[PDB]
Amino acid sequence: FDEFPIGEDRDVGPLHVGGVYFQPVEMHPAPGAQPSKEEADCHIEADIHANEAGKDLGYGVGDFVPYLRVVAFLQKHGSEKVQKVMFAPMNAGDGPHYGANVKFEEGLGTYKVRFEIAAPSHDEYSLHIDEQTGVSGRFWSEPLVAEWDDFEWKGPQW
Amino acid sequence: DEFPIGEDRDVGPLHVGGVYFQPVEMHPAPGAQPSKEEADCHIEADIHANEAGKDLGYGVGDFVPYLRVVAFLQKHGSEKVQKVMFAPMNAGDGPHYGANVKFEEGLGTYKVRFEIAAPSHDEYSLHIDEQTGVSGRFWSEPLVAEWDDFEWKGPQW
């Protein structure tokens, strides 16, 4: 299917992060508080894989990194209003990613788009740390940031 | 070195391997699993998508995250069943579900059963539109991978 870029891919910490958007989708179940397919403007996704620095956490380089907590913030240029969107983990036909249907609440124009990526909760995920079978890396304590300062929402491209 | 619990199983969209080896130290220490010191071994469920997993959007061979995996161990000759909640974690060789385990009934032959629940509807979603979505849906009853004659003969390390 057709995907449109949010901006240039980013490397931040042990993650390679891409941002794409396309038409709103129907999801099962419908996640969190996201707008329906009909009410949304688009679906936005964060593609997140481990880069070379990820190998120290035990991920295979290039593999999807699960259990992250990803939140997008959208802010139209010239506006003080910031939208906070919690992404959910989900599969499309092209595999696991984090994503959301979203509305651009201040309409057409240029937005700053910022993904804040928190590590797997210490309540949810662990690392082997023994010398024999363990890893020498550790999760990051403050969320990593991938952002694009000049994303143009010029309306549906579909 | 890793030791097999038994032959790998394919069940539904999942290829499931079970292995065990020496107890490990985990950060943070999961649930109420025994420490490296208290434990007999570490058991892991290695779970990747098989060909049928493509219908759910997975690439074949991909780790399948957000599952809930619980093991049941019953020594031959006993009516007692020990339940072990596995946790998701990384080792040097990647993401898996695992736990440190102490075999309450000790040395002997065990039935070992992994019950694998799909991601909570709370936790995970599928695109289901024709354009970008998948045709499969998650399973409702937990998938089972079971080995009837696992021989626990003590540390092999």
Ligand SMILES: [Zn+2]
């Ligand atoms: Zn890329």
Ligand SMILES: [Zn+2]
């Ligand atoms: Zn990459």
Ligand SMILES: [Zn+2]
């Ligand atoms: Zn990269």
Ligand SMILES: [Zn+2]
């Ligand atoms: Zn359902």
Ligand SMILES: [Zn+2]
């Ligand atoms: Zn991907």
Ligand SMILES: [Zn+2]
């Ligand atoms: Zn501007």
Ligand SMILES: [Zn+2]
């Ligand atoms: Zn995609």
Ligand SMILES: [Zn+2]
């Ligand atoms: Zn999506």
Ligand SMILES: [Zn+2]
């Ligand atoms: Zn196999």
Ligand SMILES: [Zn+2]
């Ligand atoms: Zn297989």
Ligand SMILES: [Zn+2]
């Ligand atoms: Zn920590």
Ligand SMILES: [Zn+2]
């Ligand atoms: Zn693996």
Ligand SMILES: [Zn+2]
């Ligand atoms: Zn494997």
Ligand SMILES: [Zn+2]
């Ligand atoms: Zn392993």
Ligand SMILES: [Zn+2]
């Ligand atoms: Zn493990």
